Amino acid sequence: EADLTDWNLPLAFMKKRHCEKIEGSKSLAQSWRMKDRMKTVSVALVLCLNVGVDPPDVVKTTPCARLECWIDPLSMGPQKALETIGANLQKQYENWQPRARYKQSLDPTVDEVKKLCTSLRRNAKEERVLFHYNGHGVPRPTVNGEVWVFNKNYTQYIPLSIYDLQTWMGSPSIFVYDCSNAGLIVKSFKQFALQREQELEVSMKNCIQLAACEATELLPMIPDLPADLFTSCLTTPIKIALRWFCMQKCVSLVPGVTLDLIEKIPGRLNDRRTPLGELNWIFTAITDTIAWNVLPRDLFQKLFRQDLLVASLFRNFLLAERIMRSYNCTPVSSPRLPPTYMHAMWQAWDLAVDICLSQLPTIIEEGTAFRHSPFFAEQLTAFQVWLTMGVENRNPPEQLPIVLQVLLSQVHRLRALDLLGRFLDLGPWAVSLALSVGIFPYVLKLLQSSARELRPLLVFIWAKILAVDSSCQADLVKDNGHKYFLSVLADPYMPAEHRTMTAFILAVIVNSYHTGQEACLQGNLIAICLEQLNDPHPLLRQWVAICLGRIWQNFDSARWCGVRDSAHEKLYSLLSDPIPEVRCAAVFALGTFVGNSAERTDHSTTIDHNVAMMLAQLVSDGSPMVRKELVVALSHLVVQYESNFCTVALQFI
Amino acid sequence: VYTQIWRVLLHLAADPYPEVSDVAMKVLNSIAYK
Amino acid sequence: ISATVQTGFCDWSARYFAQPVMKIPEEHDLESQIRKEREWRFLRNSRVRRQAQQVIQKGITRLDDQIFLNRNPGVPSVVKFHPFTPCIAVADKDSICFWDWEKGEKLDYFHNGNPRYTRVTAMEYLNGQDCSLLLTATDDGAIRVWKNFADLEKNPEMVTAWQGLSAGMVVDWEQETGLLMSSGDVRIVRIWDTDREMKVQDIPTGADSCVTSLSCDSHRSLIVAGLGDGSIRVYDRRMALSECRVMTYREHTAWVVKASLQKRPDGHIVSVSVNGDVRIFDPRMPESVNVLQIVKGLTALDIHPQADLIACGSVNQFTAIYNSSGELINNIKYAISCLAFHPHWPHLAVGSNDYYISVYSVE
């Protein structure tokens, strides 16, 4: 048949340079950058425990709930117990924020609270200050916006107005109320907030508030649970999470798992290779995933990315909402969250816990080696399955924040870096998402690694990022990540495909940025580039030449290094290259080289005339794309000798 | 030398392709008035 | 400083990394709509080649049918038939009219853009099999290419353009090789490769007069080039540039109207000068095989490779269509400066000094 002749024919003038316009893509408004980083400088632990005394409003049951901060107060005697709970509570908070000035107040007066809050505001006027209030020992807050403390003698409950309490504390602050009708405080706090706004004409968004309960609701009296149910959730999530898991009906499915085995669970909360550190790591992933899927992007970056401690509190708040719901309790937040209790990911958390502490009989008694959870593996498997048919702009993958959490270890780091690159490839919309979830500071931290297996993956990931957001050139120079890539560009064994991406990354870092031009010049880029200038790959030859042109753009020091290496001579070879992309890139670099002469020694003028005549023999060229850059290149010649070209122009008139 | 490069710019000024002729004309006219 | 323009080249290049890479391109997809429409075009092409070949085996009957007669604003200078799609570009001094011969309607009207002195001498159809383009070489040297020339939802679009060289200008497209040989008043036949967009070889012509015509052979290097003094050189580009010239036989003294070569392996250079005498040469012989004398004052001529009809013209309105052997077939009674056969169908265009375009057919 006469079809093999048709299919086997070059379609002339049908390529990217012809069909598409030679125009730069308009950069979108990259809003991923965080506006500011908050720092919780100090913490106020106001504890109205009233150990050994029962509040008159609530008639406690005989068993009641005794545990406070995982300490039986009646075991230690009244006074010591109050000091001990304050010490433990500090430690618990120091798990999440170890670098903050703690100052306990134990059954305080009003003056005592005034001097305490005013001092912490003086220390950090412009920074967030945490106010923790535990009113289990005082009567319930009133409708009139008041909170109870004691008198000097501990003979009368003195009320304290929320207005005056929010007077002494400043604008950036966060309030945690762990009492029974805690909703009343939040209502009256917002009232006095509105009342201040009305007085201001002739501190609301800044003030965060967490509350254990709704104004109508009461705290649970159940002897199995600790009395400090809310604070424990916020400050020791894994501890109550396992105790609550052992209280549900789903324990029948795993016989031989009592609370006593949970007490003696091995490990720590830091070591992710231990059983306890595994759950804490999984929990951090699950909570950060629920938040990203449920909350609107704006409010997520406000609470879960700005500062660590707030993000940790809201992460653990989501667990409180779920647990307390099961006892006719609704926690309350000032920026109202939509109900997450019914999210699918919570079911995954149960299974993850189940598999992790089904091994505990064998780990404790038999001494079996703790096998790690398949959780992170299976979640990466789900993300991979999504990518298979992920071309369309459908709902984003739920597992994106888990991929971030996986990058923190080494066990699954290779697989995650692969998948993350494949995702970024899908399009610039996806790279925007991955930057909004907050991948940047972790991908940048991996540039401190020396594992050469990472080198092809990081080169890929960074090319996609810098293609979208070119402002990240600032960050890469600060952390000396440009050295990581310089090494990859001087490695003959690295494939030429990944070396091409590296030359682009460098051509972005250097682009119109004197700090990056001065930094790459000192890292000896021009010498490295010339070593790769004669490769058998037309994509590399093109970019290496653009990269060479950008480094000496209005930077005479990089030009002088080119003069010593005699780059302009080695670039004339690219002027006769088959591929018209390379020829054009070559004309670009030779033009930018000429443009920054800045009236140097006579040598420069003879070189500029040598570079001129070598360019002046690219007039009869087929591609107009090259001839266009040839003009811009000859523009640099006119700019340098504007006084001289006026002499020639006036002659022939 | 400048005579040669000005003659080159004359070829780019009379380009068949419009975009190249336009940009070459701008740069060539930006000399005249200086 | 505002005069400093910056091209978008460096920014356009960076777009390469925004687009996806890992996945299979759209062309390799066997079930893609572009490949199916391309396979449908290639199916229609193979049919048009087969149907036209069957008509050739039945012989060539007398051709007198006039499908239509329209009038252009300008004089028709050069005419070409698109191989498969019925698009008959009939350019003028200051425009390029694109007519049709099935509906019978004006489809488009360009302006070439060339000055008043210049004239569009030659024209080709690049990638005629599919996604065709229109090369438009001006006599002064300017070559330029037009896409979307007779489309409904699209406008004129000049793909690329570059001053060549520097009779008028002559061209011979070679789809399979990818080359394009400009020539004219200069004493050089350049060969612009369009994949590398660079002049590969500069073959010296070795002739004072202008290269009036230029035709080549597919699957071989046999650049035939008629000349204004009369001679018809042949150059082989495979050997050294000095040795490229092979034969130099001279048996005419006038401008060569159309030194056309056949696509057969038995190549026959049918050269007809202004004198109007045919002399069938061969590349492997030093002298002519056949000799014919047709019209005293010839003005323009056309031939067809598939059907050996030497479509002559005349000052006295005649249109003598003889064979290469010299037999009489027709003398169609109406400066007929443009005739044009189809590459497949035995259709013959004609164009007199009056701006009237016809399309004939063999029943």
mmCIF file of N, CA, C and O in Angstrom, chain A residues 117 297 342 359 521:
data_model
loop_
_atom_site.group_PDB
_atom_site.id
_atom_site.type_symbol
_atom_site.label_atom_id
_atom_site.label_comp_id
_atom_site.label_asym_id
_atom_site.label_seq_id
_atom_site.Cartn_x
_atom_site.Cartn_y
_atom_site.Cartn_z
ATOM 1 N N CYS A 117 -0.356 38.537 84.155
ATOM 2 C CA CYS A 117 -0.665 38.814 82.755
ATOM 3 C C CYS A 117 0.044 40.069 82.258
ATOM 4 O O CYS A 117 0.554 40.092 81.133
ATOM 5 N N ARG A 297 -8.597 26.692 52.427
ATOM 6 C CA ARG A 297 -7.149 26.883 52.364
ATOM 7 C C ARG A 297 -6.690 28.085 53.182
ATOM 8 O O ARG A 297 -5.648 28.030 53.845
ATOM 9 N N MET A 342 -16.934 13.204 61.713
ATOM 10 C CA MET A 342 -17.418 12.153 60.830
ATOM 11 C C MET A 342 -16.511 11.921 59.628
ATOM 12 O O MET A 342 -16.925 11.254 58.675
ATOM 13 N N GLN A 359 0.153 -6.013 68.546
ATOM 14 C CA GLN A 359 1.440 -6.655 68.772
ATOM 15 C C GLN A 359 1.918 -6.542 70.215
ATOM 16 O O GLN A 359 2.881 -7.221 70.583
ATOM 17 N N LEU A 521 29.040 32.979 40.275
ATOM 18 C CA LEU A 521 30.372 33.312 39.776
ATOM 19 C C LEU A 521 31.452 32.754 40.695
ATOM 20 O O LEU A 521 32.415 32.130 40.236
#
